[PDB]
Write an enzyme that holds these catalytic residues in place. Sequence first.
Site, PDB file in Angstrom:
ATOM      1  N   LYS A  28     -58.472  67.547 -25.202  1.00  0.00           N
ATOM      2  CA  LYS A  28     -57.522  66.507 -25.751  1.00  0.00           C
ATOM      3  C   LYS A  28     -58.328  65.399 -26.360  1.00  0.00           C
ATOM      4  O   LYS A  28     -58.196  65.054 -27.549  1.00  0.00           O
ATOM      5  CB  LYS A  28     -56.576  66.043 -24.647  1.00  0.00           C
ATOM      6  CG  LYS A  28     -55.469  64.996 -25.083  1.00  0.00           C
ATOM      7  CD  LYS A  28     -54.455  64.753 -23.967  1.00  0.00           C
ATOM      8  CE  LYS A  28     -53.312  63.748 -24.341  1.00  0.00           C
ATOM      9  NZ  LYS A  28     -52.482  63.232 -23.147  1.00  0.00           N
TER      10      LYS A  28
ATOM     11  N   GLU B 228     -68.441  66.831 -19.336  1.00  0.00           N
ATOM     12  CA  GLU B 228     -68.711  68.258 -19.040  1.00  0.00           C
ATOM     13  C   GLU B 228     -68.523  69.188 -20.254  1.00  0.00           C
ATOM     14  O   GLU B 228     -69.347  70.063 -20.526  1.00  0.00           O
ATOM     15  CB  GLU B 228     -67.910  68.746 -17.830  1.00  0.00           C
ATOM     16  CG  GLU B 228     -68.194  67.947 -16.615  1.00  0.00           C
ATOM     17  CD  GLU B 228     -67.163  66.835 -16.316  1.00  0.00           C
ATOM     18  OE1 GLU B 228     -66.685  66.141 -17.259  1.00  0.00           O
ATOM     19  OE2 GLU B 228     -66.788  66.686 -15.119  1.00  0.00           O
TER      20      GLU B 228
ATOM     21  N   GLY C 282     -52.807  66.278 -19.641  1.00  0.00           N
ATOM     22  CA  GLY C 282     -53.668  67.413 -19.359  1.00  0.00           C
ATOM     23  C   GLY C 282     -53.215  68.336 -18.282  1.00  0.00           C
ATOM     24  O   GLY C 282     -53.211  69.575 -18.428  1.00  0.00           O
ATOM     25  N   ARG C 283     -52.768  67.779 -17.161  1.00  0.00           N
ATOM     26  CA  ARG C 283     -52.280  68.602 -16.080  1.00  0.00           C
ATOM     27  C   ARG C 283     -50.857  69.208 -16.293  1.00  0.00           C
ATOM     28  O   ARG C 283     -50.324  69.884 -15.383  1.00  0.00           O
ATOM     29  CB  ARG C 283     -52.354  67.779 -14.763  1.00  0.00           C
ATOM     30  CG  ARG C 283     -51.493  66.519 -14.758  1.00  0.00           C
ATOM     31  CD  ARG C 283     -51.741  65.683 -13.486  1.00  0.00           C
ATOM     32  NE  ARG C 283     -51.088  64.358 -13.530  1.00  0.00           N
ATOM     33  CZ  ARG C 283     -51.603  63.250 -14.051  1.00  0.00           C
ATOM     34  NH1 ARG C 283     -52.854  63.261 -14.546  1.00  0.00           N
ATOM     35  NH2 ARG C 283     -50.894  62.151 -14.052  1.00  0.00           N
TER      36      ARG C 283
ATOM     37  N   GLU D 115     -53.078  64.546  -8.608  1.00  0.00           N
ATOM     38  CA  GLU D 115     -53.470  63.616  -9.652  1.00  0.00           C
ATOM     39  C   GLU D 115     -52.243  62.815 -10.169  1.00  0.00           C
ATOM     40  O   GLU D 115     -52.400  61.690 -10.639  1.00  0.00           O
ATOM     41  CB  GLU D 115     -54.120  64.341 -10.818  1.00  0.00           C
ATOM     42  CG  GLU D 115     -54.834  63.405 -11.723  1.00  0.00           C
ATOM     43  CD  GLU D 115     -55.731  64.105 -12.730  1.00  0.00           C
ATOM     44  OE1 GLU D 115     -55.197  64.757 -13.632  1.00  0.00           O
ATOM     45  OE2 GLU D 115     -56.965  63.970 -12.600  1.00  0.00           O
TER      46      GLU D 115
ATOM     47  N   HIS E 232     -55.249  85.050   8.955  1.00  0.00           N
ATOM     48  CA  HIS E 232     -56.487  85.300   9.698  1.00  0.00           C
ATOM     49  C   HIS E 232     -57.501  84.224   9.460  1.00  0.00           C
ATOM     50  O   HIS E 232     -58.722  84.429   9.697  1.00  0.00           O
ATOM     51  CB  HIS E 232     -57.093  86.657   9.294  1.00  0.00           C
ATOM     52  CG  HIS E 232     -56.118  87.791   9.367  1.00  0.00           C
ATOM     53  ND1 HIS E 232     -56.043  88.665  10.452  1.00  0.00           N
ATOM     54  CD2 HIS E 232     -55.147  88.176   8.511  1.00  0.00           C
ATOM     55  CE1 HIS E 232     -55.068  89.528  10.237  1.00  0.00           C
ATOM     56  NE2 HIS E 232     -54.517  89.270   9.057  1.00  0.00           N
TER      57      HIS E 232
ATOM     58  N   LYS F 294     -66.538  57.915 -13.815  1.00  0.00           N
ATOM     59  CA  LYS F 294     -67.133  58.287 -15.117  1.00  0.00           C
ATOM     60  C   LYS F 294     -68.156  57.231 -15.598  1.00  0.00           C
ATOM     61  O   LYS F 294     -69.244  57.603 -16.037  1.00  0.00           O
ATOM     62  CB  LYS F 294     -66.055  58.527 -16.184  1.00  0.00           C
ATOM     63  CG  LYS F 294     -65.153  59.711 -15.907  1.00  0.00           C
ATOM     64  CD  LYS F 294     -63.982  59.831 -16.923  1.00  0.00           C
ATOM     65  CE  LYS F 294     -63.067  60.982 -16.561  1.00  0.00           C
ATOM     66  NZ  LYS F 294     -61.910  61.072 -17.519  1.00  0.00           N
TER      67      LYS F 294
HETATM   68  O1  LIG Z   1     -61.450  67.216 -22.426  1.00  0.00           O
HETATM   69  P1  LIG Z   1     -60.015  66.668 -22.144  1.00  0.00           P
HETATM   70  O2  LIG Z   1     -58.930  67.774 -22.338  1.00  0.00           O
HETATM   71  O3  LIG Z   1     -59.724  65.356 -22.964  1.00  0.00           O
HETATM   72  O4  LIG Z   1     -59.952  66.274 -20.598  1.00  0.00           O
HETATM   73  C1  LIG Z   1     -60.284  67.284 -19.617  1.00  0.00           C
HETATM   74  C2  LIG Z   1     -59.533  67.028 -18.373  1.00  0.00           C
HETATM   75  O5  LIG Z   1     -59.886  65.776 -17.805  1.00  0.00           O
HETATM   76  C3  LIG Z   1     -58.645  65.269 -17.251  1.00  0.00           C
HETATM   77  O6  LIG Z   1     -58.885  64.881 -15.931  1.00  0.00           O
HETATM   78  P2  LIG Z   1     -59.160  63.328 -15.597  1.00  0.00           P
HETATM   79  O7  LIG Z   1     -58.053  62.536 -16.251  1.00  0.00           O
HETATM   80  O8  LIG Z   1     -60.592  62.984 -16.032  1.00  0.00           O
HETATM   81  O9  LIG Z   1     -59.011  63.338 -14.031  1.00  0.00           O
HETATM   82  C4  LIG Z   1     -57.603  66.356 -17.367  1.00  0.00           C
HETATM   83  O10 LIG Z   1     -57.698  67.245 -16.242  1.00  0.00           O
HETATM   84  C5  LIG Z   1     -58.025  66.963 -18.628  1.00  0.00           C
HETATM   85  O11 LIG Z   1     -57.430  68.219 -18.876  1.00  0.00           O
HETATM   86  O1  LIG Z   2     -60.081  93.995  11.946  1.00  0.00           O
HETATM   87  P1  LIG Z   2     -60.725  92.928  12.890  1.00  0.00           P
HETATM   88  O2  LIG Z   2     -62.199  92.617  12.481  1.00  0.00           O
HETATM   89  O3  LIG Z   2     -60.567  93.325  14.405  1.00  0.00           O
HETATM   90  O4  LIG Z   2     -59.925  91.563  12.680  1.00  0.00           O
HETATM   91  C1  LIG Z   2     -59.824  91.024  11.342  1.00  0.00           C
HETATM   92  C2  LIG Z   2     -59.729  89.553  11.409  1.00  0.00           C
HETATM   93  O5  LIG Z   2     -58.560  89.143  12.103  1.00  0.00           O
HETATM   94  C3  LIG Z   2     -58.972  87.959  12.834  1.00  0.00           C
HETATM   95  O6  LIG Z   2     -58.045  86.947  12.577  1.00  0.00           O
HETATM   96  P2  LIG Z   2     -56.868  86.660  13.640  1.00  0.00           P
HETATM   97  O7  LIG Z   2     -57.522  86.530  14.995  1.00  0.00           O
HETATM   98  O8  LIG Z   2     -55.807  87.762  13.500  1.00  0.00           O
HETATM   99  O9  LIG Z   2     -56.341  85.272  13.121  1.00  0.00           O
HETATM  100  C4  LIG Z   2     -60.372  87.603  12.395  1.00  0.00           C
HETATM  101  O10 LIG Z   2     -60.321  86.804  11.201  1.00  0.00           O
HETATM  102  C5  LIG Z   2     -60.907  88.946  12.175  1.00  0.00           C
HETATM  103  O11 LIG Z   2     -62.123  88.958  11.459  1.00  0.00           O
END
Ligand SMILES: O=P(O)(O)OC[C@H]1O[C@H](OP(=O)(O)O)[C@H](O)[C@@H]1O
Ligand SMILES: O=P(O)(O)OC[C@H]1O[C@H](OP(=O)(O)O)[C@H](O)[C@@H]1O
Lengths: 541, 541
Positions: B201, B207, B262-263, B348, B379, B507
């Site tokens: 814009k 960046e 922008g957003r 934002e 998980h 900035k």
């Molecule tokens: O290069 P342009 O499109 O002008 O800006 C890039 C982005 O920066 C702005 O963020 P912020 O307002 O700096 O938080 C917007 O997210 C916008 O899309």
């Molecule tokens: O297949 P397994 O490795 O036994 O389990 C898979 C995953 O499930 C568990 O989450 P939770 O305890 O269900 O929240 C862990 O994140 C684990 O790595």
Amino acid sequence: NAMLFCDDSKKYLKEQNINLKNEFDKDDKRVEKFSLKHQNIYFDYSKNLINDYILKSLLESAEKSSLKDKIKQMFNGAKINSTEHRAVLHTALRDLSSTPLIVDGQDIRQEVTKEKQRVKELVEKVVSGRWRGFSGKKITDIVNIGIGGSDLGPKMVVRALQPYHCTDLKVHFVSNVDADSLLQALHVVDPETTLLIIASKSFSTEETLLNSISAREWLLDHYEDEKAVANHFVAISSKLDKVKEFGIDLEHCYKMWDWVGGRYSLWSSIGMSIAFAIGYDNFEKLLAGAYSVDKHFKETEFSKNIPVIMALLASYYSCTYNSQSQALLPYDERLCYFVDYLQQADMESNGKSVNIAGETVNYQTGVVLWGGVGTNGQHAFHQLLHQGNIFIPVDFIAIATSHHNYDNHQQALLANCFAQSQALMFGQSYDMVYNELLKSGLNETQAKELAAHKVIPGNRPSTTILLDELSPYSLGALIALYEHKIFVQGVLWDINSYDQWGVELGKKLGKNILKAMNDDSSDEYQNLDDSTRQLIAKVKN
Amino acid sequence: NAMLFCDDSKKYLKEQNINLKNEFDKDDKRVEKFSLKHQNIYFDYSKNLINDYILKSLLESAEKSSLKDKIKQMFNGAKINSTEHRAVLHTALRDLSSTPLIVDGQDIRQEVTKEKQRVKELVEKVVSGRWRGFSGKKITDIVNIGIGGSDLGPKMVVRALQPYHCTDLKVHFVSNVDADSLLQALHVVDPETTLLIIASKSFSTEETLLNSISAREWLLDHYEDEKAVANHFVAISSKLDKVKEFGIDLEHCYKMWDWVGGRYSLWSSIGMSIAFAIGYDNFEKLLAGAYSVDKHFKETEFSKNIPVIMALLASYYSCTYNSQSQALLPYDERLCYFVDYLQQADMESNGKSVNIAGETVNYQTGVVLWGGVGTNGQHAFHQLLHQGNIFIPVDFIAIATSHHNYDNHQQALLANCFAQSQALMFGQSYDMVYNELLKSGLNETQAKELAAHKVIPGNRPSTTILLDELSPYSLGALIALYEHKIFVQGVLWDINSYDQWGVELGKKLGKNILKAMNDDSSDEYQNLDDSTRQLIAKVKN
Ligand SMILES: O=P(O)(O)OC[C@H]1O[C@H](OP(=O)(O)O)[C@H](O)[C@@H]1O
Ligand SMILES: O=P(O)(O)OC[C@H]1O[C@H](OP(=O)(O)O)[C@H](O)[C@@H]1O
Ligand SMILES: [Ca+2]
Ligand SMILES: [Ca+2]
């Protein structure tokens, strides 16, 4: 009768009314006092809302607590996972001390070493081309099938260490039961040149079951011979008996012990997919980095102990300021899954409402962890960090040197990182803004009207953690810092960081709902609340 | 003198002590009362902590507010972005009504239509092979260069509509100043077959400047002829004068107007990268979906208006329960960037500390938005949602039908979605758990010891938003719902959702720090706080 961390004393340390600008102006030793180094990690906590008196009070709480004992108990294999009567020994997975450690009849040093040698041999056999698929072809692709702790750590590390990929294998991660996940892998891999890893401690996780069966059906649709399973699947699991019912030999089954929590498992054979991307030598470096932090954490007095300071600051804010979230802002694209990973490690550990004794606690425990890669987050949610009216502690992760020679990019990246913590600290007053708007060419009326909208309060805290580089070793150290932060917080809150009973109910209700979806005359269907019943009705019609 | 939303009245609606289980048991019209439909989106808010009296009170606040007027003002092009004296006309980008709309001397209907026809012609010329690179080759790859709103919406939509990709072009997103971002694209594209889009814009974002210059240097390193720029770059920007200094012709410059935030810009020419992935017809469908919701929002009485209900519920919780975050849980892999996108749109916008009059507000405004794709999040952090002691409102997004024939996967995905909202509602009591543990084979002592650790409080709220499918149209409708939610919240808080003054300071400080990094005798270096100074010193040594 454990010590109370969030007591009247803490809630009143706030009354010091720390002003960061004033502190840096008046204390020429601020940074020296409120920074620490561990090898090539620099931990700068000096932009936090602390002074000597507040840090001392916090360190006294740590010193008065069971923490000193609990650290020894964790490393020695005591059953600190009290509700499951289990040791908590992710530390042993990366040990380099070789001190004696016998737990539950096993020589842990021997168990860990022998299993590493097995994974190392598997990776070398595949990478060298000694492992062939069923039709005799060399493997080109690895597909990890797992969810949660059996997915996110390996996925995060593989991305984070992308510059170190060196095996000529492509590594893919299938996780969600949503078949989009399996399909993203299957669409780009050939059954004759793919090795599939079933990563499952239990071997009975719903998602991983369906994914693994579906992957097997794809493999066998191609080969039309059940014998092909042997050349194209390996398993990691603590439950060796279920692995054979699926069709996998014990020689292709890798161990996982009960004392390895899923969300602390990347260091185990569950991390084999990491090794398949970066090679086993680099996987050893990742473990060595973690070990360096384990030694720091176990041996260092609390006032100089980085994970203890991290924990004290975090719990101080969530107690005294009643904050309900913390922001983690990694200033490196390679760390794009780091917040996701730490969400699991932190929130599943410390999202608990009862203490070790089973009593409902009257203080807040684990908070929401969130964040986003910088500089991108500056254009997404840093507006809220600067001008919202939510108190949110902020951690920045900066990497001094990257993996390329675009030095202007790297310098700008770091300037931004440092500018954002500086902006949080300083803000900008009405008078500064008003004067600036006059100098921009606005008249007095216009400047008066707009100035209030540009005021940035400042005096908002941050920590910056600076790494020299993002290598296997430094990444391992970085992760371990947070593992130990989480442990310390749990101890101070007197909770069990290492169970996860809260997930059980949804697994049960899921089975009931699937039954209701397939039979509307079932008791399951009749017992539904009407919200659930009409949602099921809408996904039929 | 605007109406106060978060007043004594709200803080006391809480005293109704809604118990969800009791409500569903006693009110056989609960779902009918607390659900709405818009075309093939089903909005079920019946698991929220509301009853008739609470909803009525909330709707009265909306009715008493300026909201009815503000909706008309937004659509008519009044300068509702009051601090920048700008209209807020993202709605016009997707208009299908063709009603008269003249803003700031421009016929908005003509401006929007003509610009769409230009983007459509560009996409067709590239896809057809009529556009050639400088050496005469057809384009195969598109690289979008932009950050924040010029990156995240297009990136999120391109992923979300992956099944609809149809142009034979690969689309890549470069954003962060961290050169890893640019390198991930450059490593896989050929300068002779790549079209680069500078999405900016302002044309002066740090960046995007560095990325665009670096990309141009790569292109010219290859061709060694400045004339190649013409075949390999296009720009989108509201600032047509800076585009020519970079070397880009006006015929290759696409418009962006000041009234597109922008957003809120993916709907504009900033979305061209979406069209380059899914084709212009599908981009029109995405806009049509949003239009359907715009018509709903503009025309529907508040009690039946989905975005108004979303906003009232969210602000009710953050006022009355003092919650500081909201969780968004999309049960589809394709929506993996949806939380990231809505973080930008929501935080934002509504992370503001002063009202329209510039007065510091004494009530909390925008909260942290976070979440994660299901089932994976189950998980990772659902333990905290179930057993933590943080109050967090939860939105689930479910998709009835996916893009494949793994119907068992899809049914399990939905069962899980519905089970998780059901689990939040019901929980499980000490008595239920205790009895279950006895039936599992534990004796009385053991069951007594463990039961408290398995208690899940329940009575935790959720909304479920069910789509028939995730198509261009339904995605556009889904995004627009949240855009309007955010607008309604800002109006009720009497804030300006459409400025972002909080980012300016960082900035400026970034420019100062970069100067300090390159010259330690500078005033900039001498004026640094010592935290910033030592961080700069550490990234030299
Ligand atoms: O290069 P342009 O499109 O002008 O800006 C890039 C982005 O920066 C702005 O963020 P912020 O307002 O700096 O938080 C917007 O997210 C916008 O899309
Ligand atoms: O297949 P397994 O490795 O036994 O389990 C898979 C995953 O499930 C568990 O989450 P939770 O305890 O269900 O929240 C862990 O994140 C684990 O790595
Ligand atoms: Ca002591
Ligand atoms: Ca009215």
